Design a protein around this ligand. Structure first.
Ligand SMILES: Nc1ncnc2c1ncn2[C@@H]1O[C@H](COP(=O)(O)OP(=O)(O)OP(=O)(O)O)[C@@H](O)[C@H]1O
Ligand SMILES: [Ca+2]
Ligand SMILES: [Ca+2]
Ligand SMILES: [Mg+2]
Lengths: 118, 356
């Protein structure tokens, strides 16, 4: 459980969080599709038939605390959804077509990111 | 507020504070008693007057009085942290017996009065530290090796494999084959020297048979090492014959399968629909996976064993020596970790069974 867990998967749509110093922080919706190469993200796609696909996205320059937190948060959100979510690891530049398909404008990357929690 | 992270290794305890990128305390898992006790390095400096025991054998606690001395040493001598004022994350070996988990929980809550604690499987912490929820972890430490398949965050118990062969066997095998050159390392202190020689000079051959031949044709295989007394020792094909035992345990008199075969067998135990994700995510963990050449060699050998349609990827993280500890440090730092730990109040009113 967690404030952002409470919000997760309630309506069809796309929810994107960024790992920020060992926490799961919602990404400003105006930035959806633009991923900081130095950061890691958790993405929940909800479809109404509710089916859940969880993706964790790892930037090429993200730190071990961020990629590790992203993987753990993914497990924990899956558990919160009673394990019904399918988990997907997404590596910068090698993302699944499904993941790229979530973004009308395609995937784009930006230099930098939030600092490591280490 | 700030949790402590303790990885209970057969060879070394790794301890530190949640949020650090590495354990700030690493010491041998040794207890020495006269002819009051001493732990870690202090015990090695007092060999003559102490009897040295290893309370963790092959990853399992077997001497609980000595293990309590190790934990006391961790909190009071290394960390200088009050255990009764910090939550504690402790690691355990894959397939740790129920009774051991319950006993460790009892000792933490009733001898050390920890306010909260959590027990995590070492291999799972390593997979997390690699940024993955699915994969197979090959964790080779000092006293035990395990292959642990993990799917969407959770190990698959029915497919875990234990392999007694690990780093201490390799140190002892190097002690043995060095007699071919005339060296007689046998004492406890000499074994520590040989361990260091192993770590500095050994490597894993891509093809063992070919390496034996190329090494025979010149002296380039030979490399030196300065002993503490100042004399120089030279080591040739022992450099890669020693870790070769990981792949051919017969070198040690053991009938066991090598690490390549064991990983393969562990993947086969999992249903065919998730094997691709394990083959593609073979994650190395622990000090005995630090040999140069291991990923390339393991990739070749598992590719030979596995169906030709599978994509073999062996991942060798540069920090993998402490990835178990790093995984525990990340996990116990998350905003969601508060809800995961067992409190002393919960324990006091439920019992050591609450750990499950
Ligand atoms: N660079 C290296 N090359 C080869 N072996 C190494 C290297 N560094 C450490 N080791 C060996 O790895 C072992 C210690 O690694 P670890 O800390 O993983 O063991 P443990 O985790 O304490 O043992 P277990 O995990 O089996 O209880 C020792 O045998 C040590 O000599
Ligand atoms: Ca970052
Ligand atoms: Ca699931
Ligand atoms: Mg270990």
């Amino acid at each position: 459980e967690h404030p952002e867990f409470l919000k997760a998967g309630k309506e069809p749509g796309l929810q994107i969080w960024r790992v920020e110093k060992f926490d799961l922080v919602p990404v400003p919706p105006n930035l959806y599709g633009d991923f900081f190469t130095g950061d890691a993200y958790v993405i929940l796609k909800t479809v109404q038939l509710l089916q859940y696909d969880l993706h964790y996205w790892l930037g090429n320059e993200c730190s071990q605390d961020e990629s590790g937190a992203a993987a753990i948060f993914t497990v924990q959100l899956d558990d919160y959804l009673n394990g019904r979510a399918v988990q997907h690891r997404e590596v910068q530049g090698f993302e699944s077509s499904t993941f790229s398909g979530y973004f009308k404008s395609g995937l784009k990357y930006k230099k930098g990111g939030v600092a490591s929690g280490f | 507020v700030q949790a402590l992270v303790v990885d209970n290794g057969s060879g070394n305890v790794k301890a530190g504070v949640a949020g650090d990128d590495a354990p700030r305390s690493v010491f041998p898992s040794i207890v020495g008693r006269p002819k009051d006790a001493f732990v870690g390095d202090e015990a090695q400096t007092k060999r003559g007057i102490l009897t040295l025991k290893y309370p963790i054998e092959h990853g399992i606690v077997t001497n609980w009085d000595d293990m309590e001395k190790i934990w006391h040493h961790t909190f009071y001598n290394e960390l200088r942290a009050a255990p009764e004022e910090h939550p504690v994350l402790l690691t355990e070996a894959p397939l740790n017996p129920k009774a051991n988990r319950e006993r460790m929980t009892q000792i933490m809550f009733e001898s050390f009065n920890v306010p909260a604690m959590y027990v995590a499987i070492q291999a799972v912490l390593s997979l997390y530290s690699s940024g993955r929820t699915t994969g197979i972890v090959l964790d080779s430490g000092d006293g035990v090796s395990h292959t642990v398949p993990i799917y969407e965050g959770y190990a698959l118990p029915h497919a875990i494999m234990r392999l007694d062969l690990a780093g201490r066997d390799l140190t002892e095998y190097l002690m043995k084959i060095l007699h071919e050159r005339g060296y007689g390392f046998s004492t406890s202190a000499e074994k520590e020297i040989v361990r260091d020689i192993k770590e500095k000079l050994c490597y894993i051959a891509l093809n063992f048979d070919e390496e034996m031949k190329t090494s025979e044709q010149s002296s380039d295989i030979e490399k030196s090492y300065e002993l503490p007394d100042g004399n120089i020792i030279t080591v040739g094909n022992e450099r890669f014959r020693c870790p070769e035992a990981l792949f051919q345990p017969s070198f040690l008199g053991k009938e066991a399968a090598g690490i390549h075969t064991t990983t393969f067998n562990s993947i086969k135990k999992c249903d065919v629909d998730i094997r691709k994700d394990l083959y593609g995510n073979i994650v190395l963990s622990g000090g005995t996976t630090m040999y140069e050449g291991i990923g390339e060699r393991l990739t070749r050998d598992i590719t030979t064993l596995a169906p030709s349609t599978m994509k073999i990827k062996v991942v060798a993280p540069p920090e993998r020596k402490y990835s178990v500890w790093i995984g525990g440090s990340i996990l116990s730092s998350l905003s969601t970790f508060q809800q995961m730990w067992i409190t002393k109040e919960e324990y006091d009113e439920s019992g050591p069974s609450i750990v499950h």
